[PDB]
Ligand binder design. Structure first.
Ligand code: ZN
Ligand code: ZN
Ligand code: ZN
Lengths: 69, 115, 262, 45, 49
């Protein structure tokens, strides 16, 4: 849905490394492994936390708000 | 639904105490101490420090069920040595070692410049 | 005299050190205490005022509860269970407020830098969400389409990892001993050769390799533990180690106190 | 009276018991009741 | 974890592993039992119900 705050197994905070990860993937044309290593995710628990996330919230944001102010 | 509150893992309930000591009839000069709201963190440490003692004939602990946070520690010492005294000595030794370790770690950390 | 410590690497969030002249039980107890028994601040209660976003209220509440907060002076705060107030006061809690509105045509990211402390901290060093990245925005809490609003208040109480993992300040703790397997505490699974198939640990450089002809040393015990403590950010990693030792010492002292008083 | 929101206009309306359930802005016949005013408490665990 | 049981990490659960949302919907209509026997959505009162 949206990026998890912490890695499930060890508890490292990874919720602030999603936009940086996307910027590294897009702007710098880095592959996923090097981008993960750059952000400091060395254990594969954190690496699978960030690598396999699906950002479904964008889809949810496409629909018009039900209660619009 | 039936899940117990998590604070039951470390908070003493109403009408119960941290320690209770019961004599053991299987062997002479042996006691069983039930520690409440404790786990392997304390049990293994206490057991090892007791085994370090020379006058302790037997020392063991067990957590009878993972559901409940409590453990039983059996201590048997030589004649004329109170098992409670053995527990006191083990706890004192643990406290002294931990204090020395804290002092050493603080002194070592004070020597860093890249922190 | 006692346990001896030599530290290899020191960082803002990691400390890698050696713990020599100490029992295995003591090292494991210290590791467990660092994992579980260190008090920390974290958001515990969430009053939702307005939520027109795409996320459920308890979803956002959970995300907020996982936000690391500054806990350097957490010892000056009291547990909410043993405070004389009704629900929450200034002696036992910190009140934050998250108020975000989607007034931009593009998606607006609600980070943890938008969390504002309302309760008077009374000069303590608690409450501030931990910021680590270079951009300055904290944890990505939510996203807002244009016209969507999110207004809520959070109460943060002190807690330990035993009650909930959101209070754990210790992340992953590397713990190794006897890299050369001289104590024979493991039997290495192998197909052709155990030595070739098992990569040597980085700590093997700090011990003398076995001579391969000497007899097994049955009197040798376990000591010289290589430990690497990582910090989530709530408290500095050196404070993580020191407070773990302090908490373990407090537990043993409480055992002594109960024994004497009964 | 009681507040509702048009499922399409996203506009706010006040409806009585005798009012026909429609959105005066567009005519949509689907309305969602407004969020309650009493505070809601959530445990962040 | 014997006989197909599993041991799950409680700390992992606390951080959101396998957590779920569950929605359930109840539908209710008012039906014309007669020409003027229409049902009405209202708050029932113990005095006259
Ligand atoms: Zn991890
Ligand atoms: Zn209070
Ligand atoms: Zn309308």
């Amino acid at each position: 849905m949206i990026v998890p705050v912490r890695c499930f197994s060890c508890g490292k905070v990874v919720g602030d490394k999603w936009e940086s990860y996307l910027n590294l993937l897009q702007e710098d044309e880095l592959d996923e492994g090097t981008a993960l290593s750059r952000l400091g995710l060395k254990r594969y628990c954190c690496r699978r936390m960030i690598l396999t996330h699906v950002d479904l919230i964008e889809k949810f944001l496409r629909y018009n708000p039900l209660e619009k102010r | 639904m039936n899940a117990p509150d998590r604070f039951e893992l470390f908070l003493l309930g109403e009408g119960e105490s941290k320690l209770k000591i019961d004599p053991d009839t299987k062997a002479p000069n042996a006691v069983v101490i039930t520690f409440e709201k404790e786990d392997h963190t304390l049990g293994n440490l206490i057991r090892a420090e007791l085994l370090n003692d020379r006058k302790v004939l037997f020392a063991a602990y067990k957590v009878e069920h993972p559901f409940f946070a409590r453990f039983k520690l059996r201590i048997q010492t030589t004649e004329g040595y109170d098992p409670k005294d053995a527990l006191k000595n083990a706890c004192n030794s643990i406290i002294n070692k931990l204090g020395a370790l804290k002092t050493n770690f603080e002194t070592e950390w004070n020597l860093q410049t890249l922190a | 005299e006692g346990p001896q410590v030599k530290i290899r690497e020191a960082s803002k969030d990691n400390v890698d050190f050696i713990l020599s002249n100490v029992d295995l039980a003591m090292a494991n107890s210290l590791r467990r205490v660092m994992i579980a028994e260190i008090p920390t601040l974290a958001i515990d209660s969430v009053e939702v005022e307005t939520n027109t976003t795409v996320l459920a209220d308890e979803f956002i509440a959970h995300r907020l509860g996982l936000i690391p907060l500054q806990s350097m002076d957490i010892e000056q705060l009291e547990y909410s269970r043993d405070c004389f107030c009704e629900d929450h006061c200034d002696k036992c809690s910190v009140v934050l407020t998250l108020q975000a509105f989607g007034e931009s045509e593009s998606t607006t990211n609600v980070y943890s830098k938008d969390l504002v402390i309302v309760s008077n901290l009374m000069g303590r060093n608690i409450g501030h969400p931990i910021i680590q990245d270079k951009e300055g925005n904290g944890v990505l809490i939510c996203k807002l389409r244009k016209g969507q609003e999110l207004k809520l208040t959070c109460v943060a109480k002190k807690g330990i990892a035993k009650e909930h993992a959101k209070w754990g300040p210790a992340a992953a703790i590397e713990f190794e001993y006897d890299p050369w397997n001289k104590l024979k505490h493991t039997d290495y699974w192998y197909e052709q050769d155990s030595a070739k198939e098992w990569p040597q640990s980085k700590n093997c450089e700090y011990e003398d390799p076995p001579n391969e002809g000497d007899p097994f040393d049955y009197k040798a015990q376990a000591d010289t533990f290589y430990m690497n403590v990582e910090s989530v950010g709530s408290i500095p990693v050196d404070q993580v180690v020191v407070r773990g030792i302090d908490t373990l010492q407090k537990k043993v002292a409480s055992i002594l106190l109960a024994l004497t008083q009964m | 009276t009681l507040k509702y929101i048009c499922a399409e206009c996203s506009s706010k309306l006040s409806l009585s018991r005798t009012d026909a359930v429609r959105c005066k802005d567009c005519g949509h016949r689907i309305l969602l009741k407004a969020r309650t005013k009493r505070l809601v408490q959530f445990e962040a665990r | 974890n014997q006989e197909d049981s599993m041991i799950m990490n409680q700390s992992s659960i606390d951080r959101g592993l396998f957590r779920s949302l569950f929605f359930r919907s109840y539908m209710d209509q008012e039906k014309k039992y007669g020409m003027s026997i229409t049902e009405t959505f209202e708050k029932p009162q113990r005095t006259n119900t």
